[PDB]
Design a binder for this molecule. Structure first.
Ligand SMILES: O=C(O)/C=C/c1ccc(NC(=O)C2(NC(=O)c3ccc4c(C5CCCCC5)c5n(c4c3)CC(=O)Nc3ccccc3-5)CCCC2)cc1
Length: 541
């Protein structure tokens, strides 16, 4: 079947990516899928199902599901918004209960979805190509989204880890991800690793893939209504349905993965894992270790030789193609762990204050800096700079540029204590910047404040990026951080801790740094459990 069918009605509005480029994306994501399954696929599936069998999932109440709704989640077309949902307003609640009742009674009628072009900031690079088309987002109404949580929130939070174990990427903090990859690399006699990039993964997801995914969810111990709701949501929403633009016009139909449903991340991880594990067997890759985050796949295995490794990747690719997961860029074997870019990141190493080696995750800073520049220029709902400070806290660029720039703005605006929204693995977190030292200590360890001896390649990538973007050099940032640090120190409490810990790299004579006592009190239990991209998930912490 066709991933999409279109009426010709435009994807209407609600460098930055806009609805103008939607037509270019539509051409790429629109194709017929030809999927051929074999015994390797069937074997891996049965193994996954046996692990899913151990899961017991709870049905969330309306109230618990309402509490997970982001405050700025798109309003319902039925006369209520995200604020009404969170406040448990009679109208919102009554509508949610009728949506739920309808899921239990109607097992066939397709549910309507809205299609929108996503507005994302990318860097204006005229040397290696041109502007990227806007990504497309497909999501059901707010009432349906609350119902999805009731039936599947506990499933999507618990099941992926039970099924995939250590291969489930979203259970890891950046430090644990680094440790997993380093351990996997070290465990091989002669390691070889590769990233597998699927061309438009969401469009490659077939109706059968979605039913196979349900077959895995159905192995859980579930309440009868949860079981019916999962069955109904699969047929009416997950497998496909009609697409409506922002103007309420019929845009066409979808027969592939919707990017804005609760099961997107979980389903994509399960599907990518299933296909990859089966393709590993077809390719005869030896002693495979996989790390899967949605459509992002990394494989670490035993090298069989240079030519043999090239042949085994072509074989893996041919198998993924048969399973309807063809490649964007063909995979390349790597013989150094640092050379693998997975989840847009690479492993790097630094030294702590005692000279001990510390592995950390980094990435090219172009996109994070350009997005930070967009956010500094215009008020945004999500602060990517805050997410990048949290996730890339040990990096040279996040410490010297992002922390220095944003802490000077927060000092000037006197908004250090004001909670900000940021995204962590697709979920929305409301965070006070004053809590950053505690968060960083918990996710990366005390050493994240004392790291030095950065690699020449990492130093050069940062410095070249600053030049290209017209950002002042690192020496200017050191000078700026000293003033930012001094002002934070003068304020006391958490503000002084931000100065002392985040800006210890800036001082002539570096301070001792003892663990932050209150850091253990932060409840980070919901943090690196699961991925919720497009899942409409929220938490205050
Ligand atoms: O001695 C030497 O060798 C050179 C010294 C030197 C060179 C340049 C400056 N720049 C400045 O003073 C100003 N900009 C900045 O002090 C500045 C700060 C952050 C900037 C950012 C980001 C960095 C990440 C957080 C958000 C802001 C960008 N750009 C920035 C410029 C350059 C810019 O203007 N825009 C972009 C565009 C894309 C990406 C980054 C940038 C402020 C007044 C006039 C311009 C200062 C000192």
């Amino acid at each position: 079947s066709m991933s999409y069918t279109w009426t010709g009605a435009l994807i209407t509005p609600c460098y930055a990516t806009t609805s103008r480029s939607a037509s270019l994306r539509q051409k790429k994501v629109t194709f017929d899928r030809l999927q051929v399954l074999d015994d390797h696929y069937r074997d891996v599936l049965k193994e996954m199902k046996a692990k899913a069998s151990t899961v017991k999932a709870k049905l969330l109440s309306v109230e618990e599901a309402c509490k997970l709704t982001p405050p700025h989640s798109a309003r319902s077309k039925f006369g209520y918004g995200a604020k009404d949902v969170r406040n448990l307003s009679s109208k919102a609640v009554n509508h949610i209960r009728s949506v739920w009742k309808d899921l239990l009674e109607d097992t066939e009628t397709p549910i309507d979805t809205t299609i929108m072009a996503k507005n994302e900031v990318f860097c204006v690079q005229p040397e290696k190509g041109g502007r990227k088309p806007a990504r497309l987002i497909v999501f059901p109404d707010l009432g349906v989204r609350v119902c999805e949580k009731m039936a599947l929130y506990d499933v999507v939070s618990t099941l992926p880890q039970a099924v995939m174990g250590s291969s489930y990427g979203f259970q890891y903090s950046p430090g644990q991800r680094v440790e997993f990859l380093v351990n996997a690399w070290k465990a091989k006699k002669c390691p070889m690793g590769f990233a597998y990039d699927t061309r438009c993964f969401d469009s490659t997801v077939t109706e059968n893939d979605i039913r196979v995914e349900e077959s895995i969810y159905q192995c859980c111990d579930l309440a009868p209504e949860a079981r019916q709701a999962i069955r109904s949501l699969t047929e009416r929403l997950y497998i496909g349905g009609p697409l409506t633009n922002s103007k309420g016009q019929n845009c066409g139909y979808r027969r592939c993965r919707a990017s804005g449903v609760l099961t997107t991340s979980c389903g994509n991880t399960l599907t990518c894992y299933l296909k990859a594990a089966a393709a590993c067997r077809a390719a005869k890759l030896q002693d495979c270790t996989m790390l899967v985050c949605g459509d992002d796949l990394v494989v670490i295995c035993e090298s069989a030789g240079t030519q043999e490794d090239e042949a085994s990747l072509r074989a893996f690719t041919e198998a993924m193609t048969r399973y309807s997961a063809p490649p964007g860029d063909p995979p390349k074997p790597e013989y150094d762990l640092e050379l693998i870019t997975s989840c847009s990141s690479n492993v790097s190493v630094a030294h702590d204050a005692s000279g001990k080696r510390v592995y950390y995750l980094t990435r090219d800073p172009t996109t994070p800096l350009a997005r930070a520049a967009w956010e500094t220029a215009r008020h945004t709902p999500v602060n990517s700079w805050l997410g990048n400070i949290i996730m890339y806290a040990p990096t040279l660029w996040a410490r010297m540029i992002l922390m220095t720039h944003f802490f000077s703005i927060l000092l000037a605006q006197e908004q250090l204590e004001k909670a900000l929204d940021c995204q962590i693995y697709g979920a929305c977190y409301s965070i006070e910047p004053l809590d950053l030292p505690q968060i960083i200590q918990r996710l990366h360890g005390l050493s994240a404040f004392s790291l030095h001896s950065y690699s020449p390649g990492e130093i050069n990538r940062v410095a070249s990026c600053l030049r290209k973007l017209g950002v002042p050099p690192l020496r200017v940032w050191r000078h700026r951080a000293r003033s930012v640090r001094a002002r934070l120190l003068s304020q006391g409490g958490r503000a002084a801790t931000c100065g002392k810990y985040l800006f210890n790299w800036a001082v002539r004579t570096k301070l001792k740094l003892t663990p932050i006592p209150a850091a253990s009190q932060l409840d980070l239990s919901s943090w690196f459990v699961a991925g919720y991209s497009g899942g409409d998930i929220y938490h205050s912490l």
